[PDB]
Amino acid sequence: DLSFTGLSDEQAQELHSVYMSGLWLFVTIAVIAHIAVYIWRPWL
C-alpha cells in the first residue's frame, strides 16, 4: 500500500534480502578481524 518510493512489498523484500546478504558479509569480515586483533592485542 504505502510507498513513498514506488517499490511494492515484492521489490522491497528482494532488495532487502540482498542488502542483508551484503551486511552479514561485511559483519563476518569485521568479526573475524576483531577476533584476530583480540588475539594479537586484547583491549578488555
Binding site: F4, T5, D9, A12, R41
Partner: protein, 53 residues
C-alpha cells in the same frame, strides 16, 4: 523485524547507499586514527619496536 523491508518503501536506495558508504568509510578512518593516536595500538610503531627496527 519481519517487516523491516518497508524501509525501502520510505527511502530510496541511491541516497541511502551514498550515505552508507560515506558514513562507514568516515567511521573506519576515524577509528584507525584513534588507534594510531595511542603510542600503543599503533601497529606500525609496535612492530617497529618488537622487531627492534
Amino acid at each position: 523485524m519481519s517487516k523491516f523491508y518497508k524501509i525501502w518503501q520510505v527511502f530510496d536506495p541511491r541516497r541511502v547507499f551514498v550515505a552508507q558508504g560515506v558514513f562507514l568509510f568516515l567511521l573506519a578512518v576515524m577509528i584507525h586514527l584513534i588507534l594510531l593516536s595511542k603510542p600503543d595500538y599503533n601497529w606500525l610503531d609496535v612492530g617497529t619496536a618488537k622487531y627492534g627496527r
